[PDB]
UniProtKB/TrEMBL annotation:
A motif (Interaction with polymerase core subunit RpoC) lies at residues 55-58. Interacts transiently with the RNA polymerase catalytic core. Sigma factors are initiation factors that promote the attachment of RNA polymerase to specific initiation sites and are then released. This sigma factor is the primary sigma factor during exponential growth. It comes from Mycobacterium tuberculosis. It is found in: Cytoplasm. This is RNA polymerase sigma factor SigA. The gene is sigA. Belongs to the sigma-70 factor family. RpoD/SigA subfamily. It comes from the Bacteria.
Amino acid sequence: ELSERGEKLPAAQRRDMMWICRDGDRAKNHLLEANLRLVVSLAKRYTGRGMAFLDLIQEGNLGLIRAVEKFDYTKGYKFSTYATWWIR
DNA sequence: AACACTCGTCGCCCAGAGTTCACCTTGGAGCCAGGGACGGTTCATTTGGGGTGCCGGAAACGGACGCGTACAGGCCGTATAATGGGAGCTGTCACGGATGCA
């Protein structure tokens, strides 16, 4: 929003925003690397037909990306239950 | 064993078979002369008929044209919890050389 129709942002008001942006992206990454184990545990079951183990794993990884992007913590549910549907 | 009769065979002699040799007729075979009518040709009609180009238009007909419907394929989302694969079967030998360790 500040890019066009903004203000000459001072350093105190710019560096903090940049830092929190990087922090959020890093936290997202961290959750993904945490839950790849759930991804592989789910994808182990669909083997033996069509495509290979690693292809299934990477498709589950894409599904996990989608699940994290569309997750909602306010609902007070464990993340695994929501992510399983998207992985599948 | 002694004795007294009738029949082919031939020649000859006269008449015609039928054949030749050899005489008169007469229906010609055709040759030409003359006269149709005749069928092939040609040319006058003769209006009975074929003919037609185009259209008013009536109706089919071919298609455009606009606007509805139809599954096929695609996108999307599902909130207890569910957090590291089965399986592979492997009896070769020669052997040159790199090669990871010596």
